[PDB]
Paper text:
Here, using femtosecond X-ray crystallography, we report the structural changes that take place while electrons transfer along a chain of four conserved tryptophans in the Drosophila melanogaster (6-4) photolyase. A paradigm for electron-transfer reactions in proteins occurs in photolyases/cryptochromes, where a flavin adenine dinucleotide (FAD) cofactor is photoreduced and electrons are donated through a chain of conserved tryptophan residues. Photolyases repair DNA lesions using light as energy source. In both photolyases and cryptochromes, the photoexcited FAD extracts an electron from the nearby tryptophan, Trp407 (numbered for the Drosophila melanogaster (6-4) photolyase), within 1 ps, initiating a cascade of electron-transfer reactions along Trp384, Trp330 and Trp381.
We recorded time-dependent crystallographic data from microcrystals of Dm(6-4) photolyase dispersed in a cellulose matrix. Next, we turn our attention to the conserved salt bridge between Asp397 and Arg368, which is located on the opposing side of the FAD compared to Asn403. The sulfur atom of Met408 is located only 4.1 Å from the side chain of Trp384. Met408 seems ideal for this because it is located next to the second tryptophan, which does not have many water molecules close by, and methionines can be reversibly oxidized.
Author numbering: 5 to 504
The structure:
Amino acid sequence: RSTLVHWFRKGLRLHDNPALSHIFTAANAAPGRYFVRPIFILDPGILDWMQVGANRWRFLQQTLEDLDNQLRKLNSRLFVVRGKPAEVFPRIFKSWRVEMLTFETDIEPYSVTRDAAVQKLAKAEGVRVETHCSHTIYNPELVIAKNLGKAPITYQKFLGIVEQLKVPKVLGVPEKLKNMPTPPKDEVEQKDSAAYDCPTMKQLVKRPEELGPNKFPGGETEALRRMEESLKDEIWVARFEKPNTAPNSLEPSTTVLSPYLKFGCLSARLFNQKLKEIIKRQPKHSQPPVSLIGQLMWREFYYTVAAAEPNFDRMLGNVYCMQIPWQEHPDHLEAWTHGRTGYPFIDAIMRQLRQEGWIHHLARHAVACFLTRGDLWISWEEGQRVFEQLLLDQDWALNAGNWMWLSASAFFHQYFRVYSPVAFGKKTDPQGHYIRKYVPELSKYPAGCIYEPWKASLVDQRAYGCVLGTDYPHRIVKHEVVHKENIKRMGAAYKVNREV
Ligand SMILES: Cc1cc2nc3c(=O)[nH]c(=O)nc-3n(C[C@H](O)[C@H](O)[C@H](O)COP(=O)(O)OP(=O)(O)OC[C@H]3O[C@@H](n4cnc5c(N)ncnc54)[C@H](O)[C@@H]3O)c2cc1C
C-alpha cells in the first residue's frame, strides 16, 4: 500500500484546492490501495529568510488547528512534520512509499528554489508530482506570456491582459475519505505518538508577551465566516471605493480578509466569484481600480510583476526599482518602528500595527510615506522588514510592491504629492478618536491640537497630563522642513536614474 501526499504551504484550506481535491478523489476512486497524508512542514529554513512576529505565529497556529479539525471531518487529519523539506522528503518518500505528491504553486523565490529541489528528488524516487496554480486567480506565467514575455507594469495594462484569460473553475470541498485506515506509524511516529500533531501556542509563540488582542482568528472556518459577513451588505460591496474608506475608523473600514488570503485560508478565486455574483445583482456598482474586485486585481497585479523578478524585495538588482540613495538613520528608524516619532497620527498607526497586526491600506500609506520619501529618507527595505514582522497579512509580493509604490521607487512617480502626518488623518477622524485609542497618553488633548500636541502651551500639556519630551516624544523631524528637502533629493535621484 502506497501513500498520496498533499503538501500545504499556502493554500491552507479545504475549499477550492485542486491539489488537495485530486489526492482525495484518487484515494476514493481506488479504495484500499492508498494511504493519504496531508502534511504541513514546519521548515526551520524559512526563519533565515523572513521575520515572523508573535501575532502572525498565533494566526498560523490557529490556522493549522482549524485545518486539522477540518480534515478530521473528512476522515483524515493534518500531519505537521518538523524539519527541513530537503531532509524531510527523502525520508517520507521511502518510509511512506509515496506515489503522488501534490501542492499549490508559489512564486516567491524561496518557494521556487525549494520546490525545484523537491521536484528533482521526486523525479529520482519515481514520485509523481502534480502542482496547481490556485493561490491567485490568474497564473502569472500566463499573464507574462500573453504580454510577450514581460509583466505589465501598469494596472490598466494588466487588466486589459487578464480580461482575455479564462477564469478558473472554483472547486468545492473534497469528498470524505471512504473506508480509509489511519496510516501505519512510521519511524518517527512510533517513538512519539504526537510527533506530527498540530503545534500548540507554546511551541510556536516564543515571545507571548508580544501577543496583542485576538481579533482575527486564523483558519479557513473563520475566513469563510468573515467573507460571508463582509458580503451581507451587498450595497456596501457593490459600491465599495477603496480610496474613500477611512484609515483611522476604530472598526476596520475594509474587509480584513488579507490575512486569510495571504495564507490561502480563503480562496481568492472563491472570493472573486462571490463578488461577481453580487455585482451581477447590483447594477449600480464601482469598477476597478477602486472596487472590491479591483482590490483582488491589485493582488494579482503585484503577484505578476513579482513573479518576473527574484529581487523584487530589494532595491539593488531589481529591474523595476529606481536606485535612490536612501540614508541610514538608526535612531529615526527605531522611533518609527516603535511608534515614537512624536507625530501622533503616525505613532497611532505604528502602535495599532504592532498590537493588532493589521492596519488599513491608507494607514500603511501614511507610515510608509513618512519613513521613506516623505520624512525620514530611510530605505523602503527597512519598512518592509518591520511590516514583515508585524503584519498578519505579510506577503512577499504585496509588501514589496506597495513599498516600492509608496516610496516612488516603482509604479508610482508623482513624488511631489506627500502625505502630511498632521493633516491626513484629520479628514476622516477630526476628533482624533483613533489617536486617543492607540496613543492614550494624549487622550486629554482637545481635537484642536491632538494631531499637533506641540501647539499646546506647557501649562496645557501639564494640565492634560502629557508633557512632550517626558510622557510623549518630541517630533523627531519637522515635516515642513524635511519633506521639502526630500522632494529635491527625489528629483535628483530621478535625474540620475533617467541618465543611466
Ligand atoms: C506599504 C504597504 C505594504 C503592504 N503590505 C501588504 C502585505 O504585506 N500584505 C497584504 O496583503 N497587503 C499589503 N498591502 C496592501 C493593502 O494595504 C492590504 O492588502 C489591505 O490593507 C488589506 O486590507 P483589507 O483586506 O481590508 O483589504 P480590502 O480593501 O478589503 O481588499 C481585499 C483584498 O484585496 C487585496 N488588496 C487590497 N488592497 C491591495 C493593494 N493595495 N495591493 C495588493 N492587494 C491588495 C488584498 O488581498 C485584500 O485582502 C500593503 C500596502 C502598503 C501601502
